[PDB]
Paper text:
To increase the diversity of Ca2+-binding motifs applied in GECIs and to minimize the side-effects of GECIs overexpression in cells, we recently developed a ratiometric FGCaMP indicator and its FGCaMP2–FGCaMP4 mutants based on EGFP FP and CaM/M13 Ca2+-binding domains from Aspergillus fungi with amino acid sequences different from homologous sequences of mouse CaM and M13-peptide (85% and 40% amino acid identity for CaM and M13-peptide, respectively, between Aspergillus niger/Aspergillus fumigatus and Mus musculus). Synthetic GFP chromophore in neutral water solution has an absorption maximum at 370 nm and an absorption maximum at 470–500 nm in GFP-like fluorescent proteins has been observed due to the surrounding amino acid environment inside the protein. We have previously shown that the ratiometric indicator FGCaMP has one main absorption peak at 493 nm in Ca2+-bound state and one absorption peak at 402 nm in Ca2+-free state. FGCaMP has high mobility in mammalian cells at low calcium concentrations, as compared to GCaMP6s and G-GECO1 indicators, which is beneficial in terms of its lack of interaction with intracellular proteins.
To understand the structural basis underlying FGCaMP functioning and to search for potential mutation hotspots, we determined the crystal structure of the original FGCaMP calcium indicator in its Ca2+-bound state at 3.2 Å resolution. Like all GCaMP-like calcium indicators, according to its crystal structure, FGCaMP represents two domains: a cpEGFP moiety and a CaM/M13-peptide complex with four bound calcium ions. The cpEGFP moiety contains 11 β-strands forming a β-barrel with chromophore formed by TYG184-186 buried inside the barrel. CaM includes 8 α-helixes organized into four calcium-binding motifs (EF1–EF4). Each motif co-ordinates a single calcium ion by six contacts, as typical for calcium-binding domains. The M13-like peptide is tightly bound to the complex CaM-4 Ca2+. The CaM/M13 pair is linked to the cpEGFP moiety by two linkers (with a length of 3 and 2 amino acids, respectively) with chromophore partially exposed from the cpEGFP barrel. Hence, the residues in the positions 39, 77, 79, 181, 215, and 266 participate in the stabilization of the anionic form of the FGCaMP indicator. Based on the crystal structure analysis, we found positions that stabilize the anionic form of FGCaMP and which potentially may serve as hotspots for further mutation of GFP-like FP-based GECIs.
Numbering used by the authors: 1 to 101, 122 to 183, 187 to 412
The structure:
Amino acid sequence: RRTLHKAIDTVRAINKLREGLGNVYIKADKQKNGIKANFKIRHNIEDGGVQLAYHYQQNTPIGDGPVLLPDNHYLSVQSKLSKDPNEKRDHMVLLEFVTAAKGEELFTGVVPILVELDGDVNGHKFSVSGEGEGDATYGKLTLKFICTTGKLPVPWPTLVTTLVQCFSRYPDHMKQHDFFKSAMPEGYIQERTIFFKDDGYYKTRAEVKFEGDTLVNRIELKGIDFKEDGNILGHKLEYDVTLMADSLTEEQVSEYKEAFSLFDKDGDGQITTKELGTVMRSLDQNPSESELQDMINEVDADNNGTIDFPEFLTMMARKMKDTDSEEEIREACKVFDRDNNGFISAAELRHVMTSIGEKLTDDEVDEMIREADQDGDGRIDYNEFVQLM
Ligand SMILES: [Ca+2]
Ligand SMILES: [Ca+2]
Ligand SMILES: [Ca+2]
Ligand SMILES: [Ca+2]
């Protein structure tokens, strides 16, 4: 019958922009005079499930020169994997939008990118070449990769992380922490272990430095102890437009559009800083304009200063156990149980719906309460609430 979903999906959309969308944690490695980093990637498998890829990373400077040593922060990447319809070689088209929350001078403007990788995965050797450009200023990368040794023995999505964090847009306010540009042009060495759960592991040594106009990324990859018809060598992973981002049912994309339109009250198909701010205000939270722009900048890939529904879907569809799709809907309870008594009342349920921009009769408040209320009491409890997933 009922979609309170739009109300919850509305609150949900606010907690995600606030909590913030960044998936790659960067700690400094004083000792090795560079950076360390750990992160998961959840590759979707055809016929159900996700193939976990545990990432371990250390980058150290090549150059003798000085180098910036950061406080703990996050990088957020959104990826968009494609095929070139004309291209008939094994290839991948990557588009990336990457942001964080002396060598800087080199990344102002549009630098072209060469990428070159040598793999040995259970003695299945292969090479990949990369052409394209990076605009660090807007955090955008374009790249086309080609397997120059025939058919790639591993799925392209598993090579994405291995195939240039010096293109991450570090906002001016944080320019102090951009280790990767600071390292250039001498460059940096980026070493990783990538552990594929219940399967083998990649071992990468890459060096990232300028050769003239172009930022070059050169990679030896060794792939050890892989199950030979497991998910990697056995090619069992959905290509997926995104790395690290999921699908949604017809029922979810509808409710999400409905929630989107509670922010986008003018119907221009765009949420502005003011549009977002009114809704937040409505639910007794008064963010600053500066926070509102930071919040939008998170999902504003095309740098037009507004969230369109596509940008909103991508945020709402972030992976599955980002932390837990539960922890998140438990975090919604707070907003709805305004008195804090441990229950969301018909009164409270009204107050919210009203605030967010739902017109409703008092016979419809009552319907939602009964629709949600397993225990008979005329109140939704935090379990009753998360139950109505
Ligand atoms: Ca609008
Ligand atoms: Ca936009
Ligand atoms: Ca209450
Ligand atoms: Ca109840």
